[PDB]
Amino acid sequence: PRYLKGWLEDVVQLSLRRPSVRASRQRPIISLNERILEFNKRNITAIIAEYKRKSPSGLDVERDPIEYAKFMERYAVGLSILTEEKYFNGSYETLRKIASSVSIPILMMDFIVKESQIDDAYNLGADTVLLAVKILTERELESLLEYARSYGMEPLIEITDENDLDIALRIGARFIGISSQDDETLEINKENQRKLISMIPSNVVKVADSGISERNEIEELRKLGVNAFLIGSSLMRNPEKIKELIL
Ligand code: NI
Known part of the structure; x- marks a missing residue:
């Protein structure tokens, strides 16, 4: 990984x-x-419901993972399942029970820095992973994208800024997550995110995460070409909000 x-x-x-x-x-x-492409064809708002009991941003919730995945199976375009343990309270069992019980796409959200972690996603039943430009060297990024590609998974590559974009495009990414939060500091910048999004080739599938709770925020973002929305906190707190966000 990079020195951090x-x-x-x-x-x-x-x-x-x-x-x-x-x-x-x-x-x-x-x-x-x-x-996600399929839901763009049908004009259904495409939302990735994230399951996370804890975040370094101070979310701290207990709720049943299986009931949550099931509720979201009906409206979500897919699920994001935190498996990082120390800061998010995730675990591989959570992903495994979750993957056993629903049949919408599941992303494994963790801090992937070695191949066996991608092996861990595959064996547990996740259908793709997030990679962070910000914690990997360019050679690690490329080869971890190649490695996820080899189980037939297109990875979601997270960029926070423009230098991240340049590295992502160069290593071949076609599925890019644009984060408003910078993870190393927890600096939140929604204007920086808007600029960044207009620079992405039309040919990449674009996922956005702010700290999204409001329908208008999804709408604005769709206008700029954003294909799908990663939403955690607000759905952890009120799952049923998803209905009002999809409408
Ligand atoms: Ni991140």
């Missing part, structure tokens, strides 16, 4: 030492990016 400072460095250290998993996957890769 502070909480991010700590989590990348946790992550290098994370025990891998052994399981045979008993389900297909259901492609998150294609389904």
Whole structure:
């Protein structure tokens, strides 16, 4: 990984030492990016419901993961399942129960810094992973995209700024997540995100996460070409809000 400072460095250290998993996957890769494209065809607002009990931003909730995934199976374009343990309270069991029970696309959200972690997603039943430009070297990014591509997964590559975009495009990314939050500091900038989004080739599938709770915020973002929306906190707190966001 890159040399990092502070909480991010700590989590990348946790992550290098994370025990891998052994399981045979008993389900297909259901492609998150294609389904998002499919919901653009039908003009259905395409929302990735995130399941996370905790965030470094101070969310701290208990709720049943299986009931949540099931409720979201009906309206979500896919699910994002936090598996990082220390800062998000996630776990691989959560992903495994979640993947066993629904048949919409599932993304594994963690801090992937080694191949066995992508192996962990596949064996647990996730259909794709998030990669962070910001914690990987360019050679690690490229080869971890190649490695996820080899289980037939198109990874979601997170960019926070323009230098991230240049590295992402160069390494071949076609599925890009644009974060308003910078993870190393927790600097939130929604104007920086808007600029960044206009620079992305028309040919990449674009996912946006702010801290989205409002329908107008989704609408603005769609106008700029954003294909799908990663929404966590507000749906952790009121799942049924999803209905009003999809309408
Ligand atoms: Ni991130």
